[PDB]
Structure 1
Amino acid sequence: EGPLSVFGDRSTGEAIRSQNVMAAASIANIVKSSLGPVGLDKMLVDDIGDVTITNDGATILKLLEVEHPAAKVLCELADLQDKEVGDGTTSVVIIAAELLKNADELVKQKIHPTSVISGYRLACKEAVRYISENLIINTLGRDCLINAAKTSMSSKVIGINGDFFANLVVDAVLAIKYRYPVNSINVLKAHGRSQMESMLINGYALNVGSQGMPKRIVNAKIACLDFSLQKTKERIQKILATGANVILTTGGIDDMCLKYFVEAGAMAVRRVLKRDLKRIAKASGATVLSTLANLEASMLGQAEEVVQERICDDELILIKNTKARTSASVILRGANDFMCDEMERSLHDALCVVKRVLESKSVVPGGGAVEAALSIYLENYATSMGSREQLAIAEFARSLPVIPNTLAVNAAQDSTDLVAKLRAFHNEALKWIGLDLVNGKPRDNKQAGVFEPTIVKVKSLKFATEAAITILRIDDLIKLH
């Protein structure tokens, strides 16, 4: 009868379950290094020899040539963790592995995994509850954000005035905030003066066509035309018939057509980047009509104000006050051109961080603060459970202080110590206590700007635990080649 065939790998006893854990350990530990702001990127060179330096777990696991099937599990998790909440992709992997290492301990105690599985399922669900009860709900709330935006400007040349720019972000966001559209902030750079003069426009900033047409138009009726106005008086009569005072042609405008616009007192800007025209169709809501023979009075956008200011003494069309306040501009000014490039990229980051904080009101203090609390609360929960479940939930709480435990290691901030001081200060200064690798001491993240959406956490543990459950539920697997 024979156990199996020439093609049927059979793994039993500690042989299978163990080798599966180790694989998960190896994998997790790998991406564990790139955990935190001090992450240690990895140079991935697949078959052909390519070189992709990354810090994200998913990217790494999606390029890492894994042989052991069970190890591929952490790859599916990092995948799900990236297409659902993004960040924390590395955490899920690490935690999952720890849950196993601790699971085996009980396993060594002749404790059938099944039992252990139950402990994790109940512990995790309980852990999630503590979340919807310790949701540090941000205030649109200023103060908090200013601090966060300040952490994004630091560690850069802009760090000198990072504060001034920290506010611009909070303002630009709180203005177009409804869900924060990062693609709504038009950051226009232009070398001129010091970065201390950088301001925030109440609308769009276009870096008149004729010194005759009105430089300022109140209730503007932006008429975005695709096709140019070059072969004549009949095409200008069609635009003047709809009441379009502001014409935005993507192509060049014939000299004659421009002379007619001055005659009708219509401000039209020729040769407008395709990208700009699109932003105008989103702001004032101006319809983009290709042919000038299909432009009606119902395709005109509304811009409460479209004037040409001399920013740093340059000609710029500021089409602000549009009907859709979902459009704004942050005039970024800097000494050199190369300087405006960096400050600009910094602004983008800040806009993203602020966004996150604004999305999902229920947020919590990262730096490991959360995991710590879960380690204490779940510990007690284990005490009031008895039976194997106790050790299960218990160890589960011992697999949580890893996030902060590792963060320290990535900052020469002796783990064993900080991990501890983090607990003592956690139940003495309340939940808002995590590890700040900057000063190497338990700091108030909730006051430092360090935050993480409530959902992010919920899914990690829910993904890590379950994934481990299906693994432990594997006592003997036979997969042919």
Structure 2
Amino acid sequence: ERTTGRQAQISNITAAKAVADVIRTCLGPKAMLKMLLDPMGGLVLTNDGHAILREIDVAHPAAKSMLELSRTQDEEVGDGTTTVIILAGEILAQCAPYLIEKNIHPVIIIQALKKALTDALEVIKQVSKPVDVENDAAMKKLIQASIGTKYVIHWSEKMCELALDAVKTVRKDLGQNFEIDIKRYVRVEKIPGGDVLDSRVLKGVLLNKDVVHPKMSRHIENPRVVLLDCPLEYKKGESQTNIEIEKEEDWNRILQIEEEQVQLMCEQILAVRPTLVITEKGVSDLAQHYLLKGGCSVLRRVKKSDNNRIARVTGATIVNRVEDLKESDVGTNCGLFKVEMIGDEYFSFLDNCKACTIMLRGGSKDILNEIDRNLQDAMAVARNVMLSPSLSPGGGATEMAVSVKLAEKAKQLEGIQQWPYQAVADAMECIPRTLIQNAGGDPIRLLSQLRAKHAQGNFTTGIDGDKGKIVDMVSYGIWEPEVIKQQSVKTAIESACLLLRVDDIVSGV
């Protein structure tokens, strides 16, 4: 029913702490795969944090808040998902003692944490170095960084390629910020089989819809594309259109009219001399015929999302009513119209030998979803940099810097206001630690050394994954988008600040 007092507080903290506990063995280069079972049927074999926590229903309110943190974070940057959860926990946990043990009110611990966040954020931008968003080589060895710790690493280079080759493709600066809608303009397409490398980033689209009529062009050299909303069949009246006939030879009259309007429609289209007509709706058998000899291949039923991406790699602006069909609505700038038959399943291409279609190949419909998600992380950190050319010391280095500059300051602040501040510092340290642990090396040992080396000797010094020894980032490098280090710490400290505002929990609508 009800639970006021530290009772509340505790269960919240423990709850939140437990959330972390699950995916903590998923943060690191040697991170394991949490094969989860969804209710609907299938499975999820991913190790990408947010993709795990999504597939786990929780009860305790805090555990629900803690769980959605991984989502809002997966919405800002594509990466840094697992990290925010672990941090968001350790913060609450590291407050636990001064929260009750040292009887500090939640207002005070909040007043400090909100303060320690800003200072902490400084130390992030302070250690961050900028980068050439255009230097293909830098972007690659940047995207590569956030491809490690995932099944997609055995082709790491191959991945950053398909990543950049797609981030830049749908990009479109615009200024009067840079707009990169990976979502609506980079439709992926996972096709079972082949090899990983056998996957490319076609600059166009790929529909499996075949051709409306047999004897129709399998591939127009340079096709003239015409995209339209409206269907291709005899329309009807949006009023009480009811016909009364007693005039004998009138049946034939009307029944004919239908053929007649389908004709007109074919005309208006055929007019601008098209070779490829792709409509979102249907295609009357009649209309097929008049578009056959009219000289063009037809494609019926294609999703809006599928269509509007075509209209960016054909230029062919989509148009509804045909009696208004302009000639500006061309089909210029569009290579071939291949129709490769991929294992008993016909496809259609529209490459040009603004929106690309990443086509992945692996070894199962299952294994592909691993790739797709892994790729998304790549293609997202690429976008981040595109809109914030700043990077942060990976290997948990940044995380340790903030640990010290804060630890130092806290110790030199004096007042009850110090303890909560001190905790944010002590908290931060958990990431290089989770890393060192999931590496196998001795946490107490490596950290003391990493922390010390940090205290003076440079701040771009994190821990090396497969190794387990402290290395300098600059050295073997593994910087990550500075944006990630923003959110991870922004919302984590917020989460903590929210849950700490709770002193009572109640049940009933």
Fold similarity call, TM over 0.5? yes
Shift of 1:42: 8.8
TM-superposition CA deviations, 1:426-461 (whole Å, max 9, x none): 456644333343332335567335446253134234
Decide whether aligned partners of structure 1 residues 281 and 216 sit closer, same or farther in structure 2, where only a CA change above 3 A counts: same
Decide whether aligned partners of structure 1 residues 346 and 39 sit closer, same or farther in structure 2, where only a CA change above 3 A counts: closer
Aligned equivalents of 2:448 and 2:319: distance in 1? 65
Pair 1:176-2:180 in alignment: no
Shift of 1:77: 4.5
Shift of 1:327: 1.3
State whether residues 368 and 434 of structure 1, in contact with CA within 8 Å, keep that contact through their aligned partners in structure 2. yes
Aligned equivalents of 2:365 and 2:46: distance in 1? 26
Aligned equivalents of 1:294 and 1:309: distance in 2? 30
Q: Which runs of 5+ in 1 are unaligned?
A: 1-6, 67-71
Equivalent residue, structure 1, for 2:220:
215
Q: Pick one of 463, 470, 493 that aligns with 1:462.
A: 493
Q: CA RMSD in A?
A: 4.8
Equivalent residue, structure 2, for 1:122:
115
Matches within 5 A, 1:368-387: 368-387=396-415
Q: Pick one of 384, 388, 409 that aligns with 2:437.
A: 409
Q: Pick one of 62, 66, 71 that aligns with 1:82.
A: 71
Matches within 5 A, 1:39-54: 41=34
Partner letter of residue 327 of structure 1? A
Equivalent residue, structure 2, for 1:354:
379
272-281 vs 37-46, greater mean Cα deviation: 37-46
Partner letter of residue 350 of structure 1? L
Decide whether aligned partners of structure 1 residues 127 and 136 sit closer, same or farther in structure 2, where only a CA change above 3 A counts: same
Partner letter of residue 68 of structure 2? D
Aligned equivalents of 1:330 and 1:23: distance in 2? 40
Partner letter of residue 268 of structure 1? S
Aligned equivalents of 1:40 and 1:320: distance in 2? 36
Aligned equivalents of 1:374 and 1:29: distance in 2? 23
Equivalent residue, structure 2, for 1:247:
277
Shift of 1:93: 3.5
State whether residues 236 and 260 of structure 1, in contact with CA within 8 Å, keep that contact through their aligned partners in structure 2. no
Q: Which runs of 5+ in 2 are unaligned?
A: 76-80, 173-178, 235-258
Query: What is the DSSP-based 3-state SS (H/G/I as helix, E as strand, rest coil) of the residue aligned with 2:428?
Result: coil
TM-superposition CA deviations, 1:231-267 (whole Å, max 9, x none): 66543322133454432245475563244223xxxx3
Matches within 5 A, 1:316-331: 318-320=349-351, 326-330=354-358
Shift of 1:329: 3.6
Matches within 5 A, 1:99-110: 99-104=94-99, 108=101
Decide whether aligned partners of structure 1 residues 119 and 17 sit closer, same or farther in structure 2, where only a CA change above 3 A counts: same
- Give the TM-score normalised by the residue count of structure 1: 0.72
93-102 vs 15-24, greater mean Cα deviation: 15-24
82-91 vs 21-30, greater mean Cα deviation: 21-30
Decide whether aligned partners of structure 1 residues 277 and 238 sit closer, same or farther in structure 2, where only a CA change above 3 A counts: same
Q: Pick one of 240, 256, 263 that aligns with 2:289.
A: 256
Query: What is the DSSP-based 3-state SS (H/G/I as helix, E as strand, rest coil) of the residue aligned with 2:336?
Result: strand
Decide whether aligned partners of structure 1 residues 411 and 290 sit closer, same or farther in structure 2, where only a CA change above 3 A counts: same
State whether residues 187 and 344 of structure 1, in contact with CA within 8 Å, keep that contact through their aligned partners in structure 2. no
Matches within 5 A, 1:133-212: 133-141=126-134, 142-150=136-144, 161-178=155-172, 179-183=179-183, 184-187=185-188, 196=197, 198-206=199-207
State whether residues 337 and 351 of structure 2, in contact with CA within 8 Å, keep that contact through their aligned partners in structure 1. no
Aligned equivalents of 1:52 and 1:345: distance in 2? 9
Query: What is the DSSP-based 3-state SS (H/G/I as helix, E as strand, rest coil) of the residue aligned with 1:307?
Result: coil
Shift of 1:381: 0.8
> Looking at both structures, which has the greater relative contact order when contacts are Cα pairs under 8 Å and sequence separation is at least 6?
2
TM-superposition CA deviations, 1:34-92 (whole Å, max 9, x none): 5556257497999xxx99999757947972233xxxxx335324435523555245135
The aligned length equals 449
